[PDB]
């Protein structure tokens, strides 16, 4: 059944709750972003109102074939009334179209639902600065102190420098980047930009990217693989067997592959820095795992929460085990005692 952490009290609303059939008493279904664990269950047969960003609405229409009459896109940073309740959508700094949602309950309670987010100090100057938030539904993906990772900017500088050096040393090297969802587009766009190439990809992935309102996108991507020296493949294909296979497909146009796997966290984060990362190499193929995250580090999460000073925190990630739930509750209490709320 629908878990309590997907329901907004005092309303008929649910958030990211499309796989339970009809939720008894739901009058509006919000969707924070287009990732499959969140939209799971939506299709052309859905007949309840879906509230979301413009970009998530484009993906629902074009990829899932949800009918236009059930898609309700809302502008960001704008007070809107939904079924009698004031809401605001905020940029979540996750993937394209991803939002946080502020609910203003008729009784005066204010609720923030972060969806999935990567906390940033810029959020401290949004419409959140303007009133008190009582209850926080929090993306706790990386809620433990071991989870450090570099800034997105640091990671993209590493990727750009690595690729430019490799291709300038060997003009017959191909760059491949893995993907299995929307998000982390800066990785392949930044590398293609420094190399004066468009990124080449499958017709399905091109269609997905043409839904994201990225400025000048027609100048940056293509379905013509041959004309491109940055290819995107399914993340599954980013291994030596998959890459040797791919290289055969290019008809001796290339003699070397340099591949990127943008992971979340991996345990080499605890020891090694970004300047010191090394690839796995077999033959003329080298694979770099780069820690490009679209979720909060522990410290970023902690700063946001200590700034916001909520009365109550409801985790939305890692909630399935008693050990995880207890660990999280211990950090929340530490944070509240340190900051004095
Ligand atoms: Ni997500």
UniProtKB/Swiss-Prot annotation:
Induction: During mitosis. The mRNA encoding this protein contains an internal ribosome entry site (IRES) in its 5'-UTR. This 5'-UTR generally suppresses translation while specifically promoting expression during mitosis, when cap-dependent translation may be impaired. It comes from the Eukaryota. Expressed in brain, heart, kidney, liver, pancreas, placenta and skeletal muscle. May be required for DNA interstrand cross-link repair. Also required for checkpoint mediated cell cycle arrest in early prophase in response to mitotic spindle poisons. Possesses beta-lactamase activity, catalyzing the hydrolysis of penicillin G and nitrocefin. Exhibits no activity towards other beta-lactam antibiotic classes including cephalosporins (cefotaxime) and carbapenems (imipenem). Belongs to the DNA repair metallo-beta-lactamase (DRMBL) family. Binds constitutively to TP53BP1. Binds CDC27, which is itself a component of the anaphase promoting complex (APC). Binds PIAS1. This is DNA cross-link repair 1A protein. It comes from Homo sapiens. The gene is DCLRE1A. The chain holds residues 700 to 1040 of 1040 of the full protein.
């Amino acid at each position: 059944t629908c878990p309590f952490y997907k329901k907004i009290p005092g309303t008929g609303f649910t958030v990211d709750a499309f796989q339970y059939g009809v939720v008894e008493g739901c009058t509006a279904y919000f969707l924070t972003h287009f990732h499959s664990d969140h939209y799971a269950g939506l299709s052309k047969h859905f007949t309840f109102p879906v509230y979301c960003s413009e970009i998530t609405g484009n993906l629902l229409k074009n990829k899932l074939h949800v009918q236009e009459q059930y898609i309700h896109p809302l502008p960001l940073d704008t007070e809107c009334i939904v079924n009698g309740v004031k809401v605001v959508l905020l940029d979540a700094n996750h993937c394209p179209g991803a939002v946080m949602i502020l609910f203003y309950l008729p009784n005066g309670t204010v609720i923030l639902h972060t969806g999935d987010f990567r906390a940033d100090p810029s959020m401290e100057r949004s419409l959140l600065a303007d009133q008190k938030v009582h209850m926080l539904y929090l993306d706790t993906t990386y809620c433990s102190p071991e989870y450090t990772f570099p800034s997105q900017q640091e990671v993209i500088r590493f990727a750009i420098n690595t690729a430019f050096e490799a291709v300038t040393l060997n003009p017959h090297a191909l760059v491949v980047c893995g993907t299995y969802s929307i998000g982390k587009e800066k990785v392949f766009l930044a590398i293609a930009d420094v190399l004066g190439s468009k990124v080449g990809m499958s017709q399905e992935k091109y269609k997905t990217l043409q839904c994201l309102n990225i400025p000048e996108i027609n100048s940056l991507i293509t379905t013509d693989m041959c004309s491109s020296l940055v290819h995107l493949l399914p993340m599954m294909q980013i291994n030596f067997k998959g890459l040797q296979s791919h290289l055969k497909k290019c008809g001796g146009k290339y003699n070397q592959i340099l591949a990127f796997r943008p992971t979340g966290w991996t345990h080499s984060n605890k020891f090694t820095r970004i300047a010191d990362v090394i690839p796995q190499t077999k033959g003329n193929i080298s694979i770099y795992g780069i820690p490009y995250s679209e979720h909060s580090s522990y410290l970023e999460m902690k700063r946001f929460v200590q700034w916001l000073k909520p009365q109550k925190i409801i985790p939305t990630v890692n909630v399935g085990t008693w050990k995880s739930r207890s660990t999280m509750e211990k950090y929340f209490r530490e944070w509240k005692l340190e900051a004095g709320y």
